[PDB]
Design a binder for this molecule. Structure first.
Ligand SMILES: Nc1ncnc2c1ncn2[C@@H]1O[C@H](CO)[C@@H](O)[C@H]1O
Ligand code: MET
Ligand SMILES: O=P([O-])(O)O
Length: 511
C-alpha cells in the first residue's frame, strides 16, 4: 500500500461557496477515491484560509469579530463538502491550534537558515488578491484610483517595516527544479509561464505585517503578524503532523504527491512554496496541477431553477452525481470553461439517463423478467462479443493513465465510448426478438448477449465509483456485486453466472 497525499487549496471564507469551489473539491475527490480503489494509502486534506486583511475587512463591514466570521463561514464550506460527498480525511482551518504551532515552526526553520531579515517595505497591496504589486505593476486610472494591472483589483499604498524572505537567493535553484522535474507544474502551458516569470528575476518577499492583528503572530515579535500566504501554505504540512517530523503521519505522507489548485494562485504554490521548503530543509511536493476557471453563461438567476452558480441549488435540482459527472465531463481539465442550465440538462438526459441508465435498465429488466432474476450462464462468445469485452477490459489501464495526468474528462470519454459500443451491440443483437424465438440456438444466444452486456455495465460501474459514488453503489447492488469486491482489482474477475440479482429500478432519472 503506497502512500498518496493529495490536497486542495484552502479558500477564504469571505462569502458563500460557489461553483468554482465545488469544481475543485469534486475533481480532487475523484482522484483521492480512484487511488483508494486502486490500492493506495490515501490522505486527503481540504479546508479554509481564515486570516488576512480581506477576511478582517469583510468582518468589519458585517459588524462581527473576525474570529466569528471565520468560524461561521467555514462551517458553511465544510457542510457543502459534506453535501458533495467529499471523502476528505481532515477539514483544516488556519485557526486550528496545531496550525499555529506548525506556522511558528516553519518560520523558525527559515529564520535559523538565515533567510528572514527586517527591512523597510514600500509598495502597493491588493487586499482582494492578498498580493504585493510593484509601482510598474499598477495602472493610474483616469479617475485617480490605482489598480493592479494583472487582476484589476484596487491597490492600497503601504509603508511598513516588515520581515522579508530571501526569495532572490532561490531564483536559479527554482529554475533548476523546473528543468529537472517538469512534472512539478501541470499542465505544460502553466509551467512555461512560471519558467518565463522566474527567468525575469525574483525580488525578496515581505512576509509580515504590522498594521493589523488578524493572523498568526511572528515568534518573539508579537507586533508582527505572518503574511496570510506563509500561514496558508503551511496547512499542507499541518495536515500530516508538522512540526512533529518524527510522527508516522509525516514520515509516510509528506511530501505531497499532488497539490490541486486553480491557476489564479499558481505562483504562490510553484515559486514561493518550494522556496520556503528549500529554506526550511523539507522535501518538495511532487506535482502542482492548476485547473481552469469555470464560469456561468447568461444570468445568475434562472426563472426555472434559481441560482445557477450555487452548488447546493444545482445538487438539489439535478442530483449530486449528475452535477459531479457534468463538471468533470464538460470541461477538459486544466482548461477554462463555461456552462449554462441547458448544458447540464443535455448532459444529464443523454449521457446519464439514456446512455448509461437505459442500457443498465433494459438489460437488468430482461434478466429479472425473462431469466429468473439471476446472471445468465453464457454460451460460446462470438467475434462481436469478444470485440466489446476487449474494449471494456482495456479501460482500467487507459483510465489509470488519465487519472495520473489528471484528465478525468478523457477517462469519462473512454468509458462512454465503450458504453456507446455496448448500446450498438445491444441493438444489433436484438435480444427482444431472441427471447421469443422457439429455436434452441437463439435462446442460448440470448443468454450470452445479456451476460456480455451485464459484464460491460459492471466494469463501467466499478470504474465510475470515483465520479459517482452513490449511483455506482446502487448499480453494483443490482449487479449482485459483493461489498468487499468493489476495488479496481475486482474488474479482472468476470461476473459470476447464477448470481442472484435484486429487483431492478432506474438510477439515473430524466430531468
Ligand atoms: N470561478 C472559479 N472557477 C474555478 N475555480 C475557482 C473559482 N473560484 C475559485 N476557484 C478556486 O477555488 C480555490 C479556493 O478558493 C482556488 O484554488 C481557486 O482557484
Ligand atoms: C494555500 S491555498 C490558499 C488559497 C486562497 N485562500 C484563495 O482562496 O485563493
Ligand atoms: O500538460 P501535462 O501536465 O498534462 O502533460
Amino acid at each position: 500500500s503506497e502512500p498518496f497525499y493529495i490536497t486542495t487549496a484552502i479558500a477564504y471564507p469571505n462569502g458563500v461557496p460557489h461553483i468554482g469551489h465545488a469544481y475543485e473539491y469534486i475533481a480532487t475527490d475523484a482522484i483521492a477515491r480512484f487511488k483508494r480503489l486502486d490500492g493506495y494509502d490515501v490522505r486527503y486534506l481540504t479546508g479554509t484560509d481564515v486570516h488576512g486583511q480581506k477576511m478582517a475587512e469583510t468582518a468589519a463591514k458585517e459588524g462581527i469579530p473576525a474570529a466569528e466570521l471565520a468560524r461561521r463561514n467555514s462551517d458553511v464550506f465544510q457542510r457543502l463538502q459534506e453535501k458533495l460527498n467529499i471523502s476528505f480525511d481532515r477539514f483544516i482551518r488556519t485557526s486550528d491550534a496545531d496550525h499555529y504551532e506548525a506556522s511558528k515552526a516553519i518560520w523558525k526553520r527559515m529564520a535559523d537558515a538565515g533567510d528572514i531579515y527586517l527591512d523597510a517595505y514600500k509598495g502597493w497591496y491588493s487586499i482582494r488578491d492578498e498580493r504585493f504589486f510593484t509601482e510598474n505593476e499598477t495602472t493610474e486610472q483616469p479617475d485617480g484610483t490605482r489598480i493592479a494591472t494583472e487582476t484589476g483589483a484596487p491597490v492600497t499604498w503601504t509603508e511598513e517595516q516588515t520581515y522579508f524572505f530571501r526569495l532572490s537567493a532561490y531564483t536559479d535553484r527554482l529554475l533548476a527544479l523546473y528543468e529537472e522535474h517538469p512534472e512539478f507544474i501541470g499542465p505544460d502551458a502553466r509551467r512555461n509561464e512560471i519558467v518565463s516569470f522566474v527567468s525575469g528575476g525574483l525580488k525578496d518577499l515581505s512576509i509580515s505585517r504590522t498594521t493589523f492583528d488578524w493572523g498568526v503572530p511572528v515568534p518573539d515579535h508579537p507586533d508582527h503578524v505572518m503574511y496570510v500566504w506563509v500561514d496558508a501554505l503551511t496547512n499542507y504540512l499541518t495536515g500530516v503532523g508538522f512540526p512533529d517530523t518524527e510522527s508516522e503521519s509525516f514520515r509516510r505522507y509528506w511530501p505531497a504527491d499532488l497539490h490541486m489548485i486553480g491557476k489564479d494562485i499558481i505562483r504562490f504554490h510553484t515559486v514561493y512554496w518550494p522556496a520556503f521548503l528549500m529554506s526550511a530543509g523539507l522535501p518538495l511536493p511532487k506535482r502542482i496541477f492548476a485547473h481552469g476557471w469555470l464560469l456561468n453563461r447568461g444570468e445568475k438567476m434562472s426563472k426555472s431553477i434559481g441560482n445557477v452558480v450555487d452548488p447546493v441549488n444545482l445538487v438539489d435540482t439535478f442530483g449530486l452525481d449528475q452535477v459531479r459527472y457534468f463538471l468533470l465531463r464538460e470541461v477538459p481539465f486544466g482548461q477554462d470553461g463555461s456552462y449554462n442550465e441547458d448544458a447540464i440538462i443535455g448532459r444529464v438526459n443523454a449521457d446519464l439517463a439514456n446512455e448509461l441508465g437505459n442500457l443498465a435498465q433494459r438489460s437488468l429488466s430482461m434478466v429479472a423478467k425473462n431469466l429468473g432474476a439471476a446472471v445468465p450462464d453464457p454460451g460460446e462468445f462470438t467475434d462481436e462479443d469478444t470485440a466489446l469485452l476487449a474494449a471494456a477490459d482495456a479501460l482500467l489501464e487507459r483510465v489509470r493513465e488519465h487519472f495520473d495526468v489528471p484528465a478525468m474528462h478523457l477517462a469519462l470519454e473512454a468509458i462512454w465510448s465503450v458504453l456507446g459500443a455496448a448500446n450498438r451491440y445491444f441493438s444489433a443483437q436484438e435480444p427482444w426478438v431472441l427471447r421469443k424465438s422457439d429455436a434452441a440456438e437463439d435462446q442460448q444466444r440470448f443468454r450470452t448477449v445479456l451476460y456480455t452486456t451485464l459484464e460491460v455495465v459492471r466494469i463501467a460501474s466499478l470504474l465510475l465509483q470515483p465520479v459517482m459514488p452513490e449511483s455506482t453503489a446502487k448499480l453494483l447492488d443490482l449487479l449482485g456485486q459483493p461489498t468487499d469486491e468493489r476495488d479496481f482489482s475486482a474488474i479482472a474477475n468476470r461476473i459470476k453466472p447464477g448470481t442472484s440479482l435484486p429487483a431492478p429500478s432506474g438510477i439515473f432519472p430524466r430531468y
